[PDB]
Amino acid sequence: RVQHFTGYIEDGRGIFYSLPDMKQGDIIYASMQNTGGNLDPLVGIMAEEIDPAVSLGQVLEKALASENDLISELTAVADRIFLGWDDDGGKGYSASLEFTIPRDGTYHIFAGSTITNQRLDKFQP
Amino acid sequence: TYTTGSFQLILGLNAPQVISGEGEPEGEVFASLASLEIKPEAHVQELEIRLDKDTRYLTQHTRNLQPGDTFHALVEPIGEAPLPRLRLTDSGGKPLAFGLIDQPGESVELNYTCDQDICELVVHVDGTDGQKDSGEAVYRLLVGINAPNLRESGQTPVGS
């Protein structure tokens, strides 16, 4: 059972995908690859659909003002928002995820952009 | 003189076609790398850096790291200069590690381990906390590969 999707991400505004009525014991697989631009894929899975924008924005708020160590603050926030996630598990910066369905019900898949730095003259997430 | 370069080695056991130089891999392996039986060789390098008023940001590039390797670094100021920030990113700028201030807060240290087939690392040292023109602050930077004893090296910089 394989399905394809294509989309566009603008300024860290993610896209939700619905997985209606999965059964306990199923295994979900995900992979997200960049096909244009400077996008850095990120994927997460959760039960109740809530917009991560408000929570992820505080990570950019903290790093922009201090040291804060982004890789620490992002992991802590992600481990709360999502039941499972992956940043760079694939070829390059592409993500890949394996997730065993805990119980019976429906879940949501979140695709979007992570917080990264892409400069060597100065640090700016 | 001696010579330098890369090479391809084909070994055969009771396979007379090897001496032709065209033997394709077959059968079950019989030989292995000898260096894997012992401990790796450490490489250590120390440099002195200065952060001027207009040069408060400095970056350095590291040689390629093989999978399984380890990377350590530490910074210690010469005198009363304030402790700068330390972080580690790849060639594209993706963050990988951040510096930790020790309980005796006179130095900052960093650590990392290699997972990918080829890793290219860049070390960032910056003191642009604000806009103060401190002047001629100078720091000592110590780096090593497969050298967990950088705290007390003892030996002079060894290896490449």
Side-chain angles (χ1 to χ4, degrees), chain A residues 98-102 104-116:
Chain A
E98 178 181 351
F99 187 86
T100 293
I101 296 294
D104 201 323
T106 183
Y107 295 108
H108 293 71
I109 281 288
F110 177 80
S113 174
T114 174
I115 300 178
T116 55

Side-chain angles (χ1 to χ4, degrees), chain B residues 105-122:
Chain B
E106 301 178 357
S107 179
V108 183
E109 58 184 2
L110 184 143
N111 182 22
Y112 180 69
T113 177
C114 182
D115 303 330
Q116 291 77 37
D117 52 354
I118 45 178
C119 286
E120 304 175 2
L121 307 181
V122 178

Side-chain angles (χ1 to χ4, degrees), chain B residues 63-72 88 96 111-121 145-146:
Chain B
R63 55 180 296 181
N64 296 19
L65 265 61
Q66 273 61 30
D69 297 3
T70 169
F71 182 83
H72 297 271
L88 186 66
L96 298 179
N111 182 22
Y112 180 69
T113 177
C114 182
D115 303 330
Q116 291 77 37
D117 52 354
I118 45 178
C119 286
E120 304 175 2
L121 307 181
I145 298 182
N146 302 322

